[PDB]
Amino acid sequence: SMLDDAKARLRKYDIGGKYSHLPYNKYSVLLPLVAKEGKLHLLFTVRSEKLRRAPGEVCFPGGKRDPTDMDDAATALREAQEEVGLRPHQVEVVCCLVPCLIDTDTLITPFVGLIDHNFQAQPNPAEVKDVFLVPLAYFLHPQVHDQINHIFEYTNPEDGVTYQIKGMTANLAVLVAFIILEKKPT
Numbered sequence: 432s433m434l435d436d437a438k439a440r441l442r443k444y445d446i447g448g449k450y451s452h453l454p455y456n457k458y459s460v461l462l463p464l465v466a467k468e469g470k471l472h473l474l475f476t477v478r479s480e481k482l483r484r485a486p487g488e489v490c491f492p493g494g495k496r497d498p499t500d501m502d503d504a505a506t507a508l509r510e511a512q513e514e515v516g517l518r519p520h521q522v523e524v525v526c527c528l529v530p531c532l533i534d535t536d537t538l539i540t541p542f543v544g545l546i547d548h549n550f551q552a553q554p555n556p557a558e559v560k561d562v563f564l565v566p567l568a569y570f571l572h573p574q575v576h577d578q579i580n581h582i583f584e585y586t587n588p589e590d591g592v593t594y595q596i597k598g599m600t601a602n603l604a605v606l607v608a609f610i611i612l613e614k615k616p617t
């Protein structure tokens with residue numbers, strides 16, 4: 432099926448816990464995959480202004496590891512719950528993609544999660560200003576703007592609202608789209 436096929440593709444790129452023990456300042460992000468209307472979508476947040484890191488920006492759910500977390504996947508799930516109300520029975524973590532090195536002392540670990548069809552986001556306004564979906568296929572033919580550095584613009588056909596997706600977030604979106612959608616019969 433569609434979801435079984437996504438999982439089987441994603442498992443081929445799982446690095447596991449290989450880089451998880453190194454002595455960095457550690458953050459995790461959840462890349463949440465949602466099936467709607469026969470197709471896969473990624474869920475994004477718009478971060479609240481009040482926040483420490485990346486205020487006002489489009490980002491995946493995520494944040495800083497704390498002493499309660501059993502492992503880096505636990506950080507990603509804890510933070511997704513706090514930001515959009517995603518509960519643990521509502522997500523299956525399928526793999527750990529290549530981590531992102533930043534600022535010489537920081538490592539950000541991305542996890543891909545399949546989201547239950549009955550989940551509905553409850554934006555926590557202390558953390559998140561907005562939550563939106565983008566079809567995964569968009570990232571194969573995005574609308575690109577140069578600010579030189581590349582920025583995607585996505586307009587939601589439901590309401591005409593435009594979002595700007597850039598940086599690590601845009602890079603990880605393209606990666607997931609390639610893994611799942613490359614070389615597919617129609």
Ligand SMILES: COc1ccc(-c2ccccc2N2CCCC2=O)cc1
Nearest residue numbers: 458460484485490491492493494599
């Ligand atoms: C919601 O999850 C987050 C958000 C931000 C970060 C983060 C941490 C340290 C240095 C840079 C970081 N990023 C990554 C994108 C832009 C930005 O500021 C990690 C996890």
